[PDB]
Amino acid sequence: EQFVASDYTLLGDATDDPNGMVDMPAGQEPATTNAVPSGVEYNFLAATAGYYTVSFAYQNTANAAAYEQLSINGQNEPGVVEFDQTSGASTGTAYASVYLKAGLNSVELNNQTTDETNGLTPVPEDQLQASPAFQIGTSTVAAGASPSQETSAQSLAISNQTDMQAFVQGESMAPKQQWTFGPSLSELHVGSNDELNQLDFNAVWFRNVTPGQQAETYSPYFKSNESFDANGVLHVNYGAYSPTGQALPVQIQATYANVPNENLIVENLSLTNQNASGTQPLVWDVMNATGINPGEVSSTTWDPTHNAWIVTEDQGSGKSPLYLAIGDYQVSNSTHAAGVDGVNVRGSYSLSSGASGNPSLNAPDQGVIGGFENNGTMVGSSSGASGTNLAVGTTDSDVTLNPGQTVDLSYYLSTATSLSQLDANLDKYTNTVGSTPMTDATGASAASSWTQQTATAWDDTLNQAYNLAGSTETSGQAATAASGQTLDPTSSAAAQSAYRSSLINILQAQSPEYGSFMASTNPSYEYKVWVRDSAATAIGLDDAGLTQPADKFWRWMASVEQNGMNATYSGNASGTFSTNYGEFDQNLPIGFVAPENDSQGLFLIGSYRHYEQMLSEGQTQQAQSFISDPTVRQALVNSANWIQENIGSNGLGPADYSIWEDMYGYHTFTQVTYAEGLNAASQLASAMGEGNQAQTWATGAETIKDAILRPTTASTPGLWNAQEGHFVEMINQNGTIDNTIDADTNIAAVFGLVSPTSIYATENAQAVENALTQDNFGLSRYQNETFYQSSQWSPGGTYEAQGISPSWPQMTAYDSIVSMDSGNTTQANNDLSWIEQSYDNGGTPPGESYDWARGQPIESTSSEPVTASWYVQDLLNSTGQTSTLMPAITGQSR
Amino acid sequence: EQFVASDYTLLGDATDDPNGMVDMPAGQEPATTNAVPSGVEYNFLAATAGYYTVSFAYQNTANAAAYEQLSINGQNEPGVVEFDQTSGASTGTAYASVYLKAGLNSVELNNQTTDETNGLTPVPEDQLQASPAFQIGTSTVAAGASPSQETSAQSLAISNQTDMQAFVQGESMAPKQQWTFGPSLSELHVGSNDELNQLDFNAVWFRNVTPGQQAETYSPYFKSNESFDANGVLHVNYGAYSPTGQALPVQIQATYANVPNENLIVENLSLTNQNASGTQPLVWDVMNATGINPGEVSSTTWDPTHNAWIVTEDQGSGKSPLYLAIGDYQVSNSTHAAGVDGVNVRGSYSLSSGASGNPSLNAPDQGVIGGFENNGTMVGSSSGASGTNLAVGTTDSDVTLNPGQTVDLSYYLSTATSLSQLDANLDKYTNTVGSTTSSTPMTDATGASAASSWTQQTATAWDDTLNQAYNLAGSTETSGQAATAASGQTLDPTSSAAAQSAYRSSLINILQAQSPEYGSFMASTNPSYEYKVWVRDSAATAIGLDDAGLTQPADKFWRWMASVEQNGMNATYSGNASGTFSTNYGEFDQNLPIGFVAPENDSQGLFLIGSYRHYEQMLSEGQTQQAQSFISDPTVRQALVNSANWIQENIGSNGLGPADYSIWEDMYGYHTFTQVTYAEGLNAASQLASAMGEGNQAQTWATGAETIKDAILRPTTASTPGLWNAQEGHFVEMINQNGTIDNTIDADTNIAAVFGLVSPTSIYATENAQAVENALTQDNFGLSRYQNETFYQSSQWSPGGTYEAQGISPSWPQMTAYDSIVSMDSGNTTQANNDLSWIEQSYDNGGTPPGESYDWARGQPIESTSSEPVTASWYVQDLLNSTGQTSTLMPAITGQS
Ligand SMILES: C[C@H]1O[C@H](O[C@H]2[C@H](O)[C@@H](O)[C@@H](O[C@H]3[C@H](O)[C@@H](O)[C@@H](O)O[C@@H]3CO)O[C@@H]2CO)[C@H](O)[C@@H](O)[C@@H]1N[C@H]1C=C(CO)[C@@H](O)[C@H](O)[C@H]1O
Ligand SMILES: C[C@H]1O[C@H](O[C@H]2[C@H](O)[C@@H](O)[C@@H](O[C@H]3[C@H](O)[C@@H](O)[C@@H](O)O[C@@H]3CO)O[C@@H]2CO)[C@H](O)[C@@H](O)[C@@H]1N[C@H]1C=C(CO)[C@@H](O)[C@H](O)[C@H]1O
């Protein structure tokens, strides 16, 4: 439904504008005598309760963001709606996802931004007070949740599925990041030497040289968002120039295309003059500049044929050098320079200083970048250069930007282990896909063709995945009901976007060499592999029918299992895993919290489900290949024997730190993975040539199950509080009960260790919903828990989440799964809508957490593949395309 | 269910105490690195969703209140739980009413007091940071809502039902009150000269003179609560001495008994040493001191027979003086002094200064009070004194207070128009009830018994009055009228203890706020609203009394309202023509119109509706002579007919009556609320037509009622707009002066369904009810008047000062009551009962009906207009409607008969 300006009730100093829009006044409503909110209100009739997206068309030509409080039914929504500076004469759209009641809902936008959680404002108070006067037009209310507008992922990886990962990062990746620089392509990891970051940065500078205007270089100090399209191409949308607070009158968009089964990254910059029709055309110079890893002694010569710098970069002791081409698809207006930066790009401007002034005006006229920042002329050699701190650049000059007419400028990166291979690459990548000196025409077409090939290649990969039942997806595998299930199609556009975004994001975060997943695409978690996260990630890919990349992961996990050579206790014996591994090595264990004994079970569960999934898709050769692989078979058997042998006299396996990694004891979560691990082992027994062990493992699975379900008040305590109707966190080392309600205890019902309709499942689910809910359907891990809030361990800095016990989409996912399975589809669908609005700008799966105080996903660990997986498991479970359930544990082998 | 200390999960620096209780740490959780909440948590299984009372046994031996954030299911409840200083070795109980979900609920108390609404903390930040270390014991979760613990009424009236009203007031009656002094009996209005406040104050000073301790006078600068018991006796419970922040080791309680059909006010002070058994007994001196109205030239002589100061107080030009006796029921150890205060009792200590020090230590050794404050010896004459600024006092000395042994000290007030009548009064009131006239000297024995007997007679007399009211169906009330269903209805009994307390408290509070001379109700018992009579409030109040079967005090009101109707002799427009009422009248005059917001045209209709319901109620109770007397009284009959003719004649071209300011008094236009009163007014007139000797007018008025009803229900999009938004499914606030629609959703539009102008099951009723619930709900079942409304918050008009309510659009129990009535009538009893529970926790400390508003940000009723009889009435209408003992519905408007 559409609400035009004339449908609004005006409040306070909100006035009608002669131009038909509404004038919103500057500033925050003070707590003074007769103070009233200024803004707009209207009423919307909701046919059914649930999530709707509320949008406002607006203009903001000031050099600061405006903030308004969204209020539904007189209740201030978490956080404030941000109205960012709009380019030239363009109209922006601000939007929020809100839970509406059935029937009439009041929708109000006002300057009452004065509420606090935990003594904090959702954005700094000084920015709420500096909120400038701006204009709003039409409001829209549409059915369905939308991703967070205000919070974007600020670090994402692009993979070629073979040997090359690049990271594209905004100017700030976490609140606590003191340095500012971006957006940029800042990391490059290639198979030949995967640990090494080949680059310092590859980034784009813009210079206005419009006749009659003050010439000025805009360096990479922009607010930005970034997200994948449906076809695996990464989009970066530029906002305000942070140092001046200006929306430049040109809209800047960049796409990065890492071409699968090639060695090419295409960068496409779209420049659109957003000034009114008939205004003086703008003229811009654009520099694409690359700093090589400063420590690596490197040399470069110009290649005039391919219009590229050819770099030889040393790789350290005893390793062959890497050869890189950094090219410019524009020829006629292109100049080139090699030498030094001439500036510290990460020491020129800090976001903390606000609109402190364009740092380009302070740059000395030295180096490739200093020169361009200073007067638009790169300083250095047009032939070549050599040393540490090597920099190269290409400038495209006198680019005419007419009102409303998009101009594309493209650049490229290729790597090879030999100059001869790089030259062959360059002949390929400076021409169209099918297809000597490159022209403006052949360059433009090459960039287009290879960008399109990226899209085609990712489409062919994602066509191995199931179509979402009821969606407009047709090119994938036929939507099929899983065992036990009935198809339950969804027409939800939000579900289709999130499903697609989730799959592409999981695959782009997978090591192309090794098959291990980055737990987070943000360096806050050091790109480390958590074996739990990756296992749970692969379970999701299998559910989605993506058995190939899943298979690559399961075989990797088998290969890195600890064989017990250096065993000192059960936690690192045969059949166990390191909590962490490196993302850029075949097998580099990294010391972290230990023991975590959930990985054994999840390995068995996921491998079992992977085997069965391949059989379900008729991939019988691939299934037989997997289960008969000596490494997989031995790894699975060792893990099974570990759980079986380490069952104690109380029927529980060893104490651990488990999923939250924060307390030692007999955790319900890990105990469930033990029981279901042995269940999985029993199921696989015959196929692993271990038929005689099937009954032992089935008995083991029942023994641990019976221990979990045993009352806490029994003579030998179990993990079930019968008095309160919920699982406990854990039994402590000394036999006392940690009675804390933990949303992760829904894992019992998720795997079907208890039936989802059992008293155990329904009572536990109700306890968790009752005690751990924030923002309607956000579930906390447990109460009085400060990770992302006060905790020093908070990866993005303290109070990134302001509300204690932040909401975790993974926990909301468990609730949705258990709710769906027990016939409560209302709760299941509300949960899915909630997870969809926990996603970041442009539909990127978020990190671990969501600040229920601010209505914002956490930036610092966006994006987290395991979160994407749990959404996919949740959604496909709700359409009956998967069942998260394992076979019932009975103590009988099949 | 009970949760002992050992059932708690301890958080942060909360520790087990060797003594079996839990040590809660000092201070507020800061916003610093690794900061964690300190406190306790446990889980409670609720069989059914709804309101429960959560209690904590505790001790606080510091000289500051402790505050904790109550958190249910990880959601901070509105405001903070206050843990006040505990006397000696006593154990206190802190409690909150909370909505629980079906199944498991987490109950947590912690120091995370850092949340803000509208940039404000629910108590001053410095007090949250100063929250001292204290100990908690057992927690209790009990089914049902309880009144607000933290907020008390701070001004209540006691009536003798004939000719005397006294006001008993705490040290502060509103946040904006800059002066501090109380508790006291501060106002006294007698029938002979009702406008005049006879007193400055009558108050009690306490002096510790315990051997071996530093002697010190505690003046009336105490935190206190006050509420009526079931029998119309007013209780004042003393808290901390504000100037030192100390809970004195003696628990002080005062009862005030204004004896009906007499001229006596008894003050009973209960002193209970709360120190441990076997500790040194304490010794106290107690002064009861009275300042006369300072402006009135007065004289006093001592009466040693009755042990009282006899005051002659001038009344102004052309009026005979009033005679007062201020007496001491203690004769042994009594001294007496007359003269001047010697101090400004309202300029000695301010609450704003915090624990600034005992102001008694700064008092000069001058005057009755200065002297007692200074060294325990009143300064003045033991014979008499004369002038302006007259003060008198009696001190009772060497009162021994043993651990746990309550000692009663009693004082008295009597007034008369002649010294001869005062002497007769004094013989009566210094002896036990039904004593033969004795003018012999009062002794310690006769005094103690007199105080007791006259206090008991107050209880008996109010019991006889309230026994004319219906027993609440399903309650333990038996001494009242038999619980009866209203015609066509079935009894729906309630075993709710909360309902019984609130019902009883509501009735006694309404009657204690009625003018004994005139029958008009004070809109508020708090001077913020100048004790003015709002004719709407009083009409709606009387409707509630009639529902409760209290037809006598209702009848006294309806006859008064008839008598003060404007006859139109000086009419300048429709708003003050024949059949209209002044928005305000004086509470201390027969007929003193007071200029306020005008016109308000809702009073005409409410007069007709309430008079109709009053007539029918008397018939229902077999009071046929009283019914016939009422409807045939020339004043009542003419007043009703004039109001009916006013509504009929003033129906405009759109079928709506004249524009007005209506119930909220804040906007001019064609308000749905007032239009409903027009339509139902004519309905009432039609019903009464034959009994008023106006049978020929019955059909005209019935047609009028239908005409206005049809206009209300006419769509806003019709060529001539009505008040029904068909697109959005709700009534609009009003049509504006210029014919535009004010589309604002207003909870008062539920009045249509309350009176049955639309059936409660109609699409109109259910859609409007849903719109109001959806848009105007705070704190689960609190309903705002309308959105973006700053009365009690930012508004300069806020009677208790700005931001008394921190949350914009405060919750109004009257609006929650309408929702409960409409919900019950449409079969949604869950919503109806949740609403009743919500109103019950909107009541003030000790079960006093609140004022108009409740701050949904702080979980506290507003102090500044506590208590408001109309709020009490709407709860009574709501409750009796839910038990089927009344129906708020009028006969269906059809246009027939
Ligand atoms: C990522 C992780 O962050 C937090 O973990 C911290 C631990 O709780 C601390 O106790 C501390 O562990 C250190 C030991 O104290 C020290 O003695 C030594 O053994 O080194 C340990 C590692 O530093 O420091 C940890 C932070 O580094 C937080 O408590 C925990 O919940 C977080 N875990 C989540 C993250 C991921 C990765 O995506 C998931 O795999 C988990 O399931 C999440 O729970
Ligand atoms: C008690 C009443 O207080 C508030 O009313 C204020 C009005 O909103 C203002 O308009 C202003 O009225 C003045 C006029 O502006 C002026 O032209 C002249 O007519 O004098 C008027 C007298 O001051 O000031 C008013 C306060 O003085 C508030 O808006 C309103 O809602 C309040 N009414 C409630 C109080 C009672 C008393 O129990 C009930 O009868 C009503 O139902 C409540 O609505």
Author numbering:
A (entry chain BBB): 7 to 441, 446 to 904
B (entry chain AAA): 7 to 903
Task: Share the article's original sentences.
Bacterial exopolysaccharide, dextran, primarily composed of α-(1→6)-linked d-glucosyl residues, is synthesized from α-(1→4)-glucan dextrin or sucrose through successive anomer-retaining transglucosylation reactions by dextran dextrinase (DDase) or dextransucrase, respectively. The DDase comprises 1284 residues, with its N-terminal 902 residues being functionally essential. DDase catalyzes primarily three d-glucosyl transfer reactions: α-(1→4)-transglucosylation for MOSs resulting in their disproportionation, and α-(1→6)-transglucosylation for MOSs and isomaltooligosaccharides (IMOs). A Δ382C protomer contains two β-sandwich domains, N1 and N2, and an (α/α)6-barrel domain A. Surprisingly, domains N2, A, and the helix-loop-helix connecting them structurally resemble those of bacterial anomer-inverting glucohydrolases in glycoside hydrolase family 15 (GH15).
Therefore, the DDase minimal active form was determined to be Δ382C (Met1–Ser902), composed of domains N1, N2, and A. The wild-type and the active mutant Δ255C enzymes produced almost equal amounts of megalosaccharide (DP 10–200) and polysaccharide (DP > 100–200) from MOS, which were fractionated from the reaction products via a two-step precipitation with 40% and 90% (v/v) methanol. Finally, the acarbose-bound Δ382C crystal structure was determined at a higher resolution, 2.5 Å. The crystal structure contains four molecules (Mol A–D) in an asymmetric unit. A loop region, Thr442–Ser445, was disordered in Mol B, C, and D. Proteins, Interfaces, Structure and Assemblies (PISA) proposed that the four molecules in the asymmetric unit form two dimers (Mol A&B and C&D). Acarbose spans subsites −1 to +3 in the pocket-shaped active site formed solely by domain A. The valienamine unit of acarbose occupied subsite −1 at the bottom of the pocket, and the 6-deoxy-d-glucose and the two d-glucose units at the reducing-end side bound to the rim of the active pocket, forming subsites +1, +2, and +3. In the crystal structure, Oε2 of Glu671 is located 2.5 Å from the amine N atom of acarbose, which is equivalent to the glucosidic oxygen of natural substrates. Glu858 is positioned on the β-anomer face side of the valienamine ring. Its Oε2 is 3.1 Å from C1 of the valienamine ring (anomeric carbon equivalent), approximately 1.2 to 1.6 Å closer than the corresponding distances in GH15 inverting glucoside hydrolases. Catalytic domain A is also in contact with domain N1 of the other protomer in the dimeric state at the domain A α9→α10 loop (Thr783–Trp818) and the domain N1 β4→β5 loop (Met30–Ser44) via hydrogen bonds.
